[PDB]
Amino acid sequence: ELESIRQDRDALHMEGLIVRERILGADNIDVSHPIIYRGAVYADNMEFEQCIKLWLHALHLRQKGNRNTHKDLLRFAQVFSQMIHLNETVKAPDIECVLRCSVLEIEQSMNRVKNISDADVHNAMDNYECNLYTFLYLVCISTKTQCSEEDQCKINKQ
Amino acid sequence: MYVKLISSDGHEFIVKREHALTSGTIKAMLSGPGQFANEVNFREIPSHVLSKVCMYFTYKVRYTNSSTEIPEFPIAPEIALELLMAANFLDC
Amino acid sequence: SKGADYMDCLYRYLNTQFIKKNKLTEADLQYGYGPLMEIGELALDMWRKLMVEPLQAILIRMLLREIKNDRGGEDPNQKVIHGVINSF
Asked: Transmembrane region positions (chain B)?
């Protein structure tokens, strides 16, 4: 099989991740560097066809162990701004539902963290401030795009 | 097209029908088995308050949707509370 | 029917101030998430549950044959039938 495409560049590239997932395990560093980096160099000229497809799968199971997804949300907004700037509506009407479920599922955390932390530092407050700022831009993106009314029902329920 | 208004003290007042429909309660008292076929009897309102309550209607109806700058209603400090607890009842 | 709206006026204060202040919003009604109810519209939800639902066999059956008889030739009183259908 590999002899068939030893001269091809794409089959090795998207096969490496599948090979490494088998032995890496469920809970380890698997999507941190490679999944994001492969998606970035894809999307720089891809016209954003499957950059969301590649990026979303990481965050689907990233939530098992929860770290600071602060920066993990600042770059899902600029790209969405950029297709709409390039008059590209690749975003499927159900795409933003996942990222809006994620922001709500993280927002409640910093409240409890602040309650637990007697004094902490200013940055703990800053995370709480900035996450709402990031949510507002996503909301504006939702308003500008036109989608189905059932999608609006999902968005309003969220 | 004229409606009477009797106060608890006794003094009776009379004003136009259309000038006395700005309050929902006075409209409710005239709709039902109370078609009065009109004289509405208030059991807990003095006379001095009811005077200014009647005066307010003309002020409201006349200077509405008018470019001319509107003046100010003069209200004496002594009685100010009673107009409040009466406008609560009348919903004006 | 005329009983309810002649009583709704007598309870205007309750509807304005006490009720409608602790009830559910229209937004709460829609999209799920989120019962105190206004007098005069509460007397119309005790006519559905205890007068027509326990009786929605004979009312339908006597109608669906009177209409057939009218089709076959019959003079039923229009007002009586029309009121009953307009009730629903």
From this structure: none
